[PDB]
Amino acid sequence: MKIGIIGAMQQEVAILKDLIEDVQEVNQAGCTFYSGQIQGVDVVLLQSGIGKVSAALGTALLISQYAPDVVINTGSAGGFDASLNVGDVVISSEVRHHDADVTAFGYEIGQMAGQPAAFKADEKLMTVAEQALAQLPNTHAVRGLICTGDAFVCTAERQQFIRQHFPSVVAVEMEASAIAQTCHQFKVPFVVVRAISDVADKESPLSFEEFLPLAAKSSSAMVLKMVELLKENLYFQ
Amino acid sequence: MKIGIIGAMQQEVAILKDLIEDVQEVNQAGCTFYSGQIQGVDVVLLQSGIGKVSAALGTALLISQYAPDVVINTGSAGGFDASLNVGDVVISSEVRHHDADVTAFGYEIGQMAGQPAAFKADEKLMTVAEQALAQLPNTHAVRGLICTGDAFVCTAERQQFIRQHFPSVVAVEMEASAIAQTCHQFKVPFVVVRAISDVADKESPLSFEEFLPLAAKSSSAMVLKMVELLKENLYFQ
């Protein structure tokens, strides 16, 4: 099997990039693809750039050219769930666009026309995420709805909008729904395994730059454990 | 040369689809690609689906697999310029995301992180659009800023947010900034040539239903004229 791993920023992919053996680097359309193995499993790591369009474009190139069997989205996120602290892992049960509104034509809020209302994380991949979490016993995670938009959420008004329309939201970020929607269109299983850098408030621009390395470390530790598990997961292999 | 043409919806691509000689249809990732010739020029017509993520993934697949020399985005739009009636044409001078906000990190409103603030349409393609307009004297057109978001704009509050932040906007829609950003990352010239189906207000849902066919007709006639000009002029090799 081949594991696709996607992160937006250089800082988000650095830890995993350094673990790739026999690394082959390709640059295309503002994306960087690193292929090789991590601990004996084939991987392709994509640094996509920030936001929904870059993430969608990169994911489409990833799937069409490299044919990963699964896709794992790594990186940082803004926490909405009360139980999350900076550094904690967040796992997608499902992903929605918090900034999509085609309700004029009867779609529910966040649902894009021609799409399901939500993109559900793959059940088998989810089981692997759970096993990985069980192998990191002193770490706290929350699983739930992750909401994506083309905005860095850092105001009370935007928090209120997102909570009012997506009351179960546990975290927000800027790529996951694009990755998830793209995987959905290609019929490729995905899961998001990110970690909290800030709590999406007026302090978040400062918190984010301060704690991005911590979030990358936490998210990357989980993704690495998942890679290790997938190595000997006979359903996927 | 090879001309790439992109529209979101079935009605938006139907007129041009019917003109393709020796048509070859490929279905991939929830997109449809029609390849062949229109009046002796190679074309690839992408039916992208609706919204930024579908448009981005489709455009990435289009450019990476078919290598069009230029990209023309056709279809409908919500008019903002006061002079626009349903059926009138809009030509992009440039495109912006009206729903992007990373101003917390120094970017201007609508600018995505890691991107320029606007995506400028290609000068030669704009010239060809103007030449086409001159040969269609009973089409009224406005050239200017087109703004994109993952929303069907149909409320005074949303219309006014967009006008406040992008005062020169002439029309809005849901794919162009994704196409434009993707073309920017691949370094492929683009232009948007759309036509008005509604004026982005409370009556837009009904206006859109009524006037989508007219908008497809008007925009497609312009695009066909542009195809004929591009065949003749050798502007692009």
Ligand SMILES: CSC[C@H]1CN(Cc2c[nH]c3c(N)ncnc23)C[C@@H]1O
């Ligand atoms: C430099 S732009 C921010 C980058 C970090 N990614 C995740 C993220 C952390 N905190 C967030 C918040 N409060 N709102 C939205 N997104 C995020 C999103 C983007 O790649």
Ligand SMILES: CSC[C@H]1CN(Cc2c[nH]c3c(N)ncnc23)C[C@@H]1O
């Ligand atoms: C069924 S969703 C609408 C489809 C038609 N496209 C253009 C468009 C016309 N009027 C618009 C408006 N008021 N707001 C945003 N977009 C548009 C966008 C999408 O493909």
